[PDB]
Design an enzyme around this catalytic site. Structure first.
Site, mmCIF file in Angstrom:
data_model
loop_
_atom_site.group_PDB
_atom_site.id
_atom_site.type_symbol
_atom_site.label_atom_id
_atom_site.label_comp_id
_atom_site.label_asym_id
_atom_site.label_seq_id
_atom_site.Cartn_x
_atom_site.Cartn_y
_atom_site.Cartn_z
ATOM 1 N N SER D 135 0.843 -1.187 0.000
ATOM 2 C CA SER D 135 0.000 0.000 0.000
ATOM 3 C C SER D 135 0.882 1.241 0.000
ATOM 4 C CB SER D 135 -0.929 0.008 1.213
ATOM 5 O OG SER D 135 -0.191 0.133 2.415
ATOM 6 N N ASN D 223 -10.222 -7.258 -3.646
ATOM 7 C CA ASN D 223 -9.133 -8.215 -3.503
ATOM 8 C C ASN D 223 -9.342 -9.423 -4.405
ATOM 9 O OD1 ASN D 223 -7.805 -6.625 -1.579
ATOM 10 N ND2 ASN D 223 -8.959 -7.544 0.111
ATOM 11 N N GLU D 249 9.813 -12.104 -20.994
ATOM 12 C CA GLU D 249 9.178 -11.725 -22.254
ATOM 13 C C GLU D 249 8.132 -10.645 -22.037
ATOM 14 O OE1 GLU D 249 8.368 -15.680 -23.272
ATOM 15 O OE2 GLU D 249 9.404 -15.649 -25.206
HETATM 16 N N1 LIG Z 1 -8.112 -2.072 -2.117
HETATM 17 C C1 LIG Z 1 -7.690 -2.199 -0.863
HETATM 18 N N2 LIG Z 1 -6.910 -1.212 -0.295
HETATM 19 C C2 LIG Z 1 -6.476 -1.333 0.982
HETATM 20 C C3 LIG Z 1 -6.814 -2.451 1.729
HETATM 21 N N3 LIG Z 1 -6.260 -2.317 2.952
HETATM 22 C C4 LIG Z 1 -5.579 -1.150 2.993
HETATM 23 N N4 LIG Z 1 -5.713 -0.522 1.784
HETATM 24 C C5 LIG Z 1 -5.117 0.772 1.403
HETATM 25 O O1 LIG Z 1 -4.227 1.216 2.408
HETATM 26 C C6 LIG Z 1 -4.358 2.605 2.614
HETATM 27 C C7 LIG Z 1 -4.074 2.972 4.065
HETATM 28 O O2 LIG Z 1 -2.943 2.289 4.560
HETATM 29 P P1 LIG Z 1 -3.138 0.905 5.353
HETATM 30 O O3 LIG Z 1 -2.982 -0.262 4.412
HETATM 31 O O4 LIG Z 1 -4.486 0.892 6.031
HETATM 32 O O5 LIG Z 1 -1.979 0.861 6.465
HETATM 33 P P2 LIG Z 1 -0.471 0.497 6.052
HETATM 34 O O6 LIG Z 1 -0.269 0.657 4.567
HETATM 35 O O7 LIG Z 1 -0.163 -0.910 6.494
HETATM 36 O O8 LIG Z 1 0.426 1.547 6.874
HETATM 37 P P3 LIG Z 1 0.151 1.765 8.443
HETATM 38 O O9 LIG Z 1 -1.106 2.586 8.594
HETATM 39 O O10 LIG Z 1 1.310 2.500 9.069
HETATM 40 O O11 LIG Z 1 -0.035 0.428 9.114
HETATM 41 C C8 LIG Z 1 -5.784 2.941 2.224
HETATM 42 O O12 LIG Z 1 -5.834 4.180 1.559
HETATM 43 C C9 LIG Z 1 -6.204 1.828 1.288
HETATM 44 O O13 LIG Z 1 -6.273 2.312 -0.031
HETATM 45 C C10 LIG Z 1 -7.598 -3.447 1.164
HETATM 46 O O14 LIG Z 1 -7.901 -4.440 1.821
HETATM 47 N N5 LIG Z 1 -8.035 -3.317 -0.135
#
Ligand SMILES: Nc1nc2c(ncn2[C@@H]2O[C@H](COP(=O)(O)OP(=O)(O)OP(=O)(O)O)[C@@H](O)[C@H]2O)c(=O)[nH]1
Ligand SMILES: Nc1nc2c(ncn2[C@@H]2O[C@H](COP(=O)(O)OP(=O)(O)O)[C@@H](O)[C@H]2O)c(=O)[nH]1
Ligand SMILES: [Mg+2]
EC number: 3.6.5.-
Lengths: 430, 77, 199, 434, 49, 369
Positions: D135, D223, D249
């Protein structure tokens, strides 16, 4: 596991904290005897956050109680849920503060805090990994405002990295019940800005207003008000104890909600609040929940946010829902009310989801907002301060026991500067 | 605000049809002590929160693996 | 053989290995409880002898089959062949809780009555009328058209629904957990009606 | 012989790896416990390795600093599948701060992660590359992913890296301080990733709505779609087909210049179980739906830019003759335009295996599917709007003290901004004609 | 070393087709035998009408 | 008026997944209407289909508009209460002294209003018949009954209906047949009993005994072998429409009275691929395989084995042409002419080749067992 310790001082802290531990114990399925009788396995996964387990299998809360008189500590012990608190965690004097800031901060507070600081120090190192502190006290009183702010300073110099929260009951002139409020209100505010990382102000008049109109209760009591405050407290740390889709802890709140170091005063709210006789006649949907949590009359402060512009707000959803509505509703309310959000920061609302709602409820939301409309509390208090300090009335008690008018001038000056800078960004443009 | 006033203690019935008579009736019906039990202790849970629909759902992450199609077990040919 | 003190010697051997792996700030009951839940995939709440043998192997206490049978047999008093690890873990928790006359170790050795779901049913039944308790007994008898003395999963749902109680899924799980202790798939209504009525 | 190692760091990375591994297990017929009933080709060797007797373990590593998501993975239905020490869990969450997960608390986990990846690589014999799911708009995601990429790029060298990042949407997003972390992560990944795929969330919400008639989408659906894309992309590496394409490729066909490797994905057909059987589902129309601008998984309009290279991976019962006719019609179409210096812009891969369907899902059982990864100059719009968002709030130095106080030097913001501006300028120059 | 398994696998799939045609032909003659039996009877039944 | 609402569940073929509906039944004017759980759209609205009252029960299979539905359970208390009374089970047993009267016994059971959920014919060996009737032991009746039971073939039954545990016995008559003639002449024993130990049939006395017998006879864990020969025999199948029309009693006796010795018959529920492979001798063969294959799986059916000196053609002589319309004109006294209604539902089905009769009976009683 990033557990937090609880410190409660004064009469407000003891009453609010006692009601708080009732809600958490109910949420975690713990009887007043301390023996677990819960339902789901999810209730034990993170029980170490708020409770310590003793030999024999009973769980005891990690809380410290503070007062200069035994007047309120005996009642809470004799009341319901009073057997949870460890007797070694009760510390008290025998004289009282008498609604005097200096007595609880210079003469009696200094001699007594040596014992309690030992209790907090033992509690903190006993657990594995700290996450922070949370404080419940009052600023319009003697022992709560006097001793309370001294311990904030003392623990800050020892744990400079840990976060710290306060749930402050600042006074409002409409509920006039003390004639010396402006003196010790300003002093506590002055000391609170250099040490506390997050402050959440609460007003009795706002709480009374919610009970009369929203709940439509003909005659409330402190028991009702203490429950509403306790509801908001548990909702803040919801993602810290239960699985969710977007977890957010205390530190993640501060990063998103604090743009500048001296801008850390917040106003909070809770939803949904519904009268007993009209609960089944309305539906529980995200559009309904988001409508009430932005209502100007739903928050715990008498200040009207429609007289200022929000800098940043946070919403902590709970229960089962779809993220599409949560994201869409936040964007929808941010666009139709663009005049109430400051322009030079885009997307100034954060959302989080936790799957476990409070017992007996389907969905709930805790709203924490950082708006310039909180200057009214400091503006109105300062007006009463200078109106009474001009004639030097009610002054000899403070100055007669090691207090000087110099830091009265310093406290008033700094708070006035805080007001000026806090509303400066209201007029600021990119 | 001139509540209480001209409606003193009573049990059952609509009351006197003044002020907040309607809201207090359902509060009185659900729990005996419809207005500020004197100092039958009052529990703040039902007065503030409301009717309880007790249920603890799943975490939506223990939802990936479980999913079943009944037709795929048919003996077919 | 292993009827004599050899039977209780293995408990001390097994208790020591549990204590070694016990996390700080936690009792031995939770340490062994997570081992059993890790193995069973049905999440029903009961295990067979094969799962019980595997769980002990995780802690390193592996013995021959004839010793394992006795340990299973000692705790399986009813000889049904399905033990509940809720009672197993609670037994070891009190063993490690120590001996102290001043403090009782509470803990759990038997599944308790759920409580509030039964109390809510009793209060609600009083609203229908004097013969409401007859209806609950009448419903069970008439729904049980075959006169066997037990009801299934769905049949119990219908009987409660027939009376007029729309209990949620969690409430059924709690009520069904205590009354069907080892998950036979059937519940004896005669015990259930006795408890809800009172003494 | 041929294997890939998948890195799942961050909350989004783990929550999408859950669906990815569910789909892989269901596709190869591996039970959640780990035993394969079968009833035997080694087509699973890409994702699973046999233990010598019975169960198959994935080549997966999970990273996060908050134990919340890791613990529920260890507790749920897949408790017996993953290696117990391959789910690395930290102590304190990065708390939405890039500097936290890159300088202070993220420095004590990379040693363990590198040790585990080294053990996995040593166990492997014909490693193909790495797949990274992370993310961008988060604390431990961006920072720790950046640090892992920096470590791997010097530790292993020429092994290919493919990243499936989740960029912030233009309007729909959760955090408020996300522009900073996004910019820093862009600066980090630009030099160390070889293939990047944009996977923002709002576009997939529109896809699910408009296709499946679902008004309440949730992260689970997104997902599942991402996992379907991953499986469609990697199927040819492990299943037999007429035209096979492996990952070297892929870059050789999709990366015109070393600094231009940002791409966006599209998938089709995406239809429910009600409308699927009344419609033709021909090869000619699924390739049209793939090139339809509204069907792409990144919120970008291709009509404002050109096309540089497109990869089309067909799976099912497709015939190579029909693909040529469909591609000819697409080339004839005037709305879709290519770059002058790219006369041929299509690489075709065909796999015999029809798509797999998860029970209880939203997609129906179809017989043909196509996934298209395309490189285009229109992707500069997302960088432009991100830059616009950054500069507006950086003028008054908002939330800067949160980053400087943890150890980040203030001068890194300017470097990241300059790098993004240079990337935008490079994208602008290429699009001109000769 | 894996070439041994491939050769045996091809042997089985080659033999199944070899045994399939023999089974199909034996069942195909019953198709013709029953068709002639019912065909004659309809002529007999029609003539009786 | 009043409405009966069920839950139906149809297995689609083009789509693998299975669906579910409601099938509301307005009994005031006998009209069908279906509504679905998912997507909340009315499926089939307020159109009559002539569905009888008796066939509505749990597990029943009814066909509407070329898609066959399967009732799984009720949907509300009002519907559940009406039909939960008709769920009683009882064990009816035909003793080997009334073997020639099987068709007559079955028919009057059918007109009694009860329903035969399952049925099978077998020979009880010496050891298991001794364990059966285990409550007697000391009584001298025990040894005589045990020796009698192992004599010859036995027909077992399970009856489903209202008050079936005692409605079965009241038509069954007094336990002693000699006193039955003067008390209740119109009864099973009054018509087909000789003496006390050779009474016509047997019934259930208690619900616990009903459980003991039903699991002894029709359960999966049963030690009763399907005693049947596989030489000099052909198989005949009573089509489901005859079972629905209640003529199965009138066919078994008619077959028995022609001089054909029946060796085994059993009740079967079979699916479309299983029924498709049965007529694989008719696959692309003359009779338009599709409809006859589809109808055979549209409900419960009886499968019979017939043994005679020249099994194939002699039985085929009395079965008649496979078209009842042409049978009625020329062979007026044959089974298909008297029972069949049209080409696809021509009553009984018998094999019509000299050499394939051995495998035809082996498929039902060995392969499908
Ligand atoms: N599509 C999708 N995006 C996710 C999901 N989980 C988190 N995100 C994305 O992650 C972003 C926020 O960061 P998080 O993943 O919640 O937290 P992190 O990246 O682990 O970083 P920390 O907050 O420090 O733990 C959001 O804007 C989401 O877009 C998910 O299950 N599906
Ligand atoms: N909401 C709420 N307010 C309280 C409670 N108890 C006291 N207060 C408020 O606190 C103020 C007095 O503060 P005080 O107890 O004298 O402060 P202290 O002397 O430092 O402990 C009054 O104005 C009350 O309105 C309580 O239980 N709930
Ligand atoms: Mg995280």
């Amino acid at each position: 596991m990033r557990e937090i310790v609880h410190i409660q001082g004064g009469q407000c802290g003891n009453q609010i904290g006692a009601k708080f531990w009732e809600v958490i114990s109910d949420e975690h399925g713990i009887d007043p005897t301390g023996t677990y009788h819960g339902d789901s396995d999810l209730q034990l996964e993170r029980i170490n956050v708020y409770y310590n387990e003793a030999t024999g299998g009973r769980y005891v809360p990690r809380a410290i109680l503070m007062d200069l008189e035994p007047g309120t500590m005996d009642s809470v012990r004799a009341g319901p849920f009073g057997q949870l608190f460890r007797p070694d965690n009760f510390v008290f004097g025998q004289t009282g503060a008498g609604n005097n800031w200096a007595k609880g901060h210079y003469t009696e507070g200094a001699e007594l805090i040596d014992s309690v600081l030992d209790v907090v120090r033992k509690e903190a190192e006993g657990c594995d990994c700290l996450q922070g502190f949370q404080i419940t006290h009052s600023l319009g009183g003697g022992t709560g405002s006097g001793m309370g702010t001294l311990l904030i300073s003392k623990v800050r110099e020892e744990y400079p990295d840990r976060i710290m929260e306060t749930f402050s009951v600042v006074p409002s002139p409409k509920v006039s019940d003390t004639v010396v409020e402006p003196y010790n209100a300003t002093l506590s505010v002055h000391q609170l800005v250099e040490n506390a990382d997050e402050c959440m102000v609460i007003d009795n008049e706002a709480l009374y207003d919610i009970c009369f109109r929203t709940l439509k209760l003909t005659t409330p009591t402190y028991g009702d008000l203490n429950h509403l405050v306790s509801a908001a407290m548990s909702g803040v740390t919801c993602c810290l104890r239960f699985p969710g889709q977007l977890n957010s802890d205390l530190r993640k709140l501060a990063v998103n909600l604090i743009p500048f170091p001296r801008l850390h005063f917040f106003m909070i709210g809770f939803a949904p609040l519904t009268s007993r006789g009209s609960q089944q006649y309305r539906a529980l949907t995200v559009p309904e929940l988001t409508q009430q949590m932005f209502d100007a009359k739903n928050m715990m402060c008498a200040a009207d946010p429609r007289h200022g512009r929000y800098l940043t707000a946070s919403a902590l959803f709970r229960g089962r829902m779809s993220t599409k509505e949560v994201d869409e509703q936040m964007l929808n309310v941010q666009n139709k009310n663009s005049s109430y959000f400051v322009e030079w920061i885009p997307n100034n609302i954060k959302s989080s989801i936790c799957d476990i709602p409070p017992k007996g409820l389907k969905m709930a939301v805790t709203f924490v907002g950082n708006s310039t409309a909180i200057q009214e509390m400091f503006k109105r208090v300062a007006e009463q301060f200078t109106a009474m300090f001009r004639r030097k009335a009610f002054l000899h008690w403070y100055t007669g026991e090691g207090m000087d008018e110099m830091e009265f001038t310093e406290a008033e000056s700094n708070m006035n500067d805080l007001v000026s800078e806090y509303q400066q960004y209201q007029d600021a443009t990119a | 605000t001139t509540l209480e006033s001209y409606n003193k203690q009573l049990q059952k019935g609509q009351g006197t049809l003044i002020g907040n008579w309607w809201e207090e009736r359902e509060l009185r019906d659900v729990t005996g002590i419809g207005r500020s039990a004197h100092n039958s202790v009052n529990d703040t849970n039902e007065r503030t929160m409301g009717k309880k629909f007790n249920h603890i759902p799943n975490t939506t992450n223990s939802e990936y693996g479980k999913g079943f199609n009944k037709a795929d077990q048919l003996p077919r040919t | 053989y292993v009827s004599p003190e050899r039977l209780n010697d293995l408990e001390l051997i097994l208790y020591e290995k549990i204590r070694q792996k016990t996390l700080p700030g936690e009792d031995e009951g939770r340490t062994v409880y997570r081992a059993f839940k890790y193995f069973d995939i049905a999440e029903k709440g009961v295990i067979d002898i094969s799962q019980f043998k595997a769980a002990l192997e995780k802690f390193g206490c592996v013995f021959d089959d004839k010793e394992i049978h006795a340990l299973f047999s000692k705790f399986d008093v009813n000889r049904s062949g399905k033990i509940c690890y809720d009672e197993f873990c609670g037994n070891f928790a009190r063993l490690g809780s120590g001996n102290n006359p001043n403090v009782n170790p509470v803990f759990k050795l038997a599944r308790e009555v759920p409580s509030p779901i039964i109390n809510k049913l009793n209060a609600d039944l009083k609203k229908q009328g004097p013969f409401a308790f007859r209806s609950l007994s009448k419903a069970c008898q008439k729904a049980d058209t075959f006169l066997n003395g037990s009801l299934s999963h769905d049949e119990f749902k219908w009987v409660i629904k027939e009376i007029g109680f729309s209990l949620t899924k969690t409430e059924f799980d709690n009520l069904f957990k205590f009354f069907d202790k080892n998950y036979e798939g059937k519940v004896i209504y005669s015990v259930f009606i006795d408890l809800v009525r009172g003494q | 012989m041929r294997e890939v190692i998948s890195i799942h760091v961050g909350q989004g990375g783990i929550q999408v790896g859950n669906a990815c591994w569910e789909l892989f297990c269901l596709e190869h017929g591996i039970q959640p416990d780990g035993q394969m009933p079968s009833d035997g080709d080694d087509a699973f060797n890409t994702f699973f390795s046999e233990t010598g007797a019975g169960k198959h373990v994935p080549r997966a590593v999970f990273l996060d600093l908050e134990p919340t998501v890791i613990d529920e993975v260890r507790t749920g239905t897949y408790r017996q599948l993953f290696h117990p020490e391959q789910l690395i869990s930290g102590k304190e969450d990065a708390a939405n701060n890039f500097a936290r997960g890159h300088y202070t608390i993220g420095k004590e986990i990379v040693d363990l992660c590198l040790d585990r990846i080294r053990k996995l690589a040593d166990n492997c014999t014909g490693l193909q590359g790495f797949l990274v799911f992370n993310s961008v708009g988060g604390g431990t995601g961006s920072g720790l992913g950046s640090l892992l990429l920096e470590r791997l790029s010097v530790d292993y060298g020429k092994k290919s890296k493919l990243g499936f990042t989740i960029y912030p949407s233009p309007q729909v997003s959760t955090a408020v301080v996300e522009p900073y972390n996004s910019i820093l992560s862009t600066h980090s990944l630009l030099e160390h990733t070889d293939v990047a795929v944009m996977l923002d969330n709002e576009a997939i919400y529109d896809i699910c709505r408009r296709n499946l008639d679902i008004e309440r989408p949730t992260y689970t659906n997104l997902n599942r779609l991402i996992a379907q894309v991953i499986s469609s992309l990697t199927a040819s590496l492990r299943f037999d087909g007429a035209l096979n394409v492996d990952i070297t490729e892929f870059q050789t066909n999709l990366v015109p210049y070393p600094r231009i490797h940002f791409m966006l994905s599209s998938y089709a057909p995406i239809i429910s179980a009600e409308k699927a059987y009344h419609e033709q589902l021909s090869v000619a129309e699924i390739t049209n739906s793939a090139f339809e601008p509204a069907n792409m998984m990144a919120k970008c309009d291709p009509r404002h830019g050109k096309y540089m290279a497109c990869s089309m991976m067909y799976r099912g019962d497709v015939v190579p003759k029909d693909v040529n006719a469909s591609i000819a019609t697409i080339k004839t179409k005037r709305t879709i335009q290519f770059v002058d210096w790219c006369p041929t812009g299509f690489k075709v891969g065909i796999n015999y295996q029809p798509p797999t369907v998860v029970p209880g899902g939203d997609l129906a059982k179809v017989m043909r599917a196509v996934c298209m990864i395309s490189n285009s100059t229109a992707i500069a719009e997302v960088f432009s709007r991100l830059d616009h968002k950054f500069d507006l709030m950086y003028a008054k130095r908002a939330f800067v003290h949160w980053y400087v106080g943890e150890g980040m030097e203030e001068g890194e913001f300017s470097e990241a901004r300059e790098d993004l501006a240079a990337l935008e300028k490079d994208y602008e120059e290429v699009g001109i004609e000769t | 070393n894996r070439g041994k398994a491939v050769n045996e696998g091809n042997y089985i799939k080659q033999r199944l087709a070899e045994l399939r045609v023999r089974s199909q032909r034996a069942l195909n003659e019953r198709r013709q035998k029953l068709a002639t039996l019912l065909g004659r009877e309809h002529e007999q039944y029609k003539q009786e009408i | 008026d009043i409405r009966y609402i069920f839950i139906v569940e149809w297995f689609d073929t083009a789509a693998s997944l299975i669906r579910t509906y409601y099938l509301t039944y307005f009994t005031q004017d006998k009209t069908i209407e279906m509504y679905d759980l998912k997507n909340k759209k009315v499926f089939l609205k307020r159109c009559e289909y002539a569905i009888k009252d008796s066939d509505l029960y749990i597990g029943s299979i009814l066909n509407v508009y070329s898609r066959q539905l399967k009732i799984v359970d009720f949907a509300d208390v009002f519907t559940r209460s009406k039909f939960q009374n008709i769920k009683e089970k009882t064990f009816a047993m035909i003793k080997p002294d009334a073997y020639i009267h099987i068709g007559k016994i079955i028919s009057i059971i059918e007109r009694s209003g009860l329903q035969i959920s399952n049925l099978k014919m077998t020979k009880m060996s010496q050891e298991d018949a001794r364990e059966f009737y285990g409550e007697h032991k000391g009584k001298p009746f025990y040894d005589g009954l045990v020796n009698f039971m192992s004599s010859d073939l036995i027909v077992g039954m399970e009856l489903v209906g209202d008050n079936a545990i005692k409605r079965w016995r009241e038509l069954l008559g007094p336990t002693n047949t000699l006193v039955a003639r003067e008390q209740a002449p119109n009864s099973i024993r009054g018509l087909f009993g000789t003496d006390g130990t050779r009474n016509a049939c047997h019934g259930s006395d208690s619900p616990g005994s009903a459980f003991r017998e039903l699991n002894f006879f029709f359960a999966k864990t049963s030690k009763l072998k399907t005693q049947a020969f596989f030489n000099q025999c052909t198989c005949c199948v009573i089509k489901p429409h005859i079972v629905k029309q209640n003529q199965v009693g009138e066919v078994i006796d008619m077959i028995l009275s022609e001089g054909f010795e029946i060796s085994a018959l059993q009740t079967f529920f079979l699916d479309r691929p299983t029924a498709e492979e049965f007529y694989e001798v008719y696959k692309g063969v003359l009779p338009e395989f599709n409809a006859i294959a589809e109808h055979l799986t549209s409900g419960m059916c009886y499968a019979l084995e017939v043994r005679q000196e020249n099994a194939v053609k002699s039985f085929r002589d009395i079965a008649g042409p496979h078209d009842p319309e042409i049978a009625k004109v020329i062979r007026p006294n044959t089974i298909r002419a008297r029972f069949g209604i049209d080409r696809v539902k021509n009553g009984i089905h018998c094999t019509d080749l000299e050499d394939d009769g051995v495998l035809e009976v082996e498929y039902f009683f060995n392969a499908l067992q």
